[PDB]
Amino acid sequence: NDPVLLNLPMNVTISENSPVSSFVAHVLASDADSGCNALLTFNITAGNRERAFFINATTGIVTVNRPLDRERIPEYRLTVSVKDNPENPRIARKDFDLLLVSLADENDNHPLFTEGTYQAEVMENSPAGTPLTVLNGPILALDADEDVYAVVTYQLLGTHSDLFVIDNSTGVVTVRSGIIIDREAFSPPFLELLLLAEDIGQLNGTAHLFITILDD
Ligand SMILES: [Ca+2]
Ligand SMILES: [Ca+2]
Ligand SMILES: [Ca+2]
Ligand SMILES: [Cl-]
């Protein structure tokens, strides 16, 4: 008959930060079917995108071969082959099956605001809950990580930040209650604030928020 892959098909999760030559899997085989017990050669025949993986041809150990990135290629479908090496290379008896490599998400990305500087305006005397008018799209930071490491919370900083509240989940900025804004109070009538976006690993990004206080 044939040699046999014993532990394939197999699913394994490794860190997207697994360094080059770190262990991924040990592929096991037997040639007890045909009863020959001939010497076995392993190889990866398909799915090996940019040769990100390396299989030791005598031991069947699969190692990381290039830097990995869940954000670039999150999953590999590797076809592993085992063959005997008889005098004629067409007597060659073979078996083929799948080693599926999932990359577990590492927190290697930080929240990036959609703008370096947001341009905003608030009318003086505006009541509590009045949102900023933000003229370059909504306040938004995006974190490229998968799910848990991509949840963003927002804070607002600088002198006269206390006139406003930020929803620490949506990034929406509103006038704080008990505060009414007098344009004549401010020299100049123009605030330079800092927006801060943080993931649960405390990796953050920042953006300027420039606010014109308008007349009425
Ligand atoms: Ca990555
Ligand atoms: Ca990641
Ligand atoms: Ca992150
Ligand atoms: Cl391929």
Structural domain spans, the chain = 1-106, 107-216
CA distance 98 to 115: 44
User: What is the 45 CA–ligand 2 centroid distance (Å)?
Assistant: 28
- For the CA atoms of 66, 69, 70, 73, the dihedral, rounded to the nearest 10 degrees, stands at -70
How much distance in Å is there from the Cα of 61 to the middle of ligand 4? 20
CA dihedral 195, 116, 106, 200 (to 10 degrees): 0
Ligand in closest contact with the CA of 202 = 3
CB atoms within 5 A of ion ligand 2 belong to 70, 105-106, 108, 145
Ligand 1 centroid to Cα of residue 62, in Å, is 21
Helix (H, G, I), strand (E, B) or coil at 65: coil
Q: Which ligand is nearest to the CA of 76?
A: 4
Number of residues assigned to the chain? 216
* CA–CA distance, 9 with 5 (Å, rounded to integer): 8
Compute the Cα dihedral for 134, 138, 143, 147 and give only its sign.
positive
Which ligand neighbours the alpha carbon of 44 most closely?
Answer: 4
The structure was resolved to a resolution in Å of: 2.3
Q: Tell me, in angstroms, the distance from the centre of ligand 3 to residue 16's CA.
A: 13
**Tokens describing residue 138:** 């909504």
Residues 6+ apart with CB under 8 A from 99: 8, 9, 10, 12, 24, 25, 27, 62, 78, 80
Residue 156, beta-bridge partner list: 195
Measuring CA to CA, which residue among 93, 97, 92 is closest to residue 28? 97
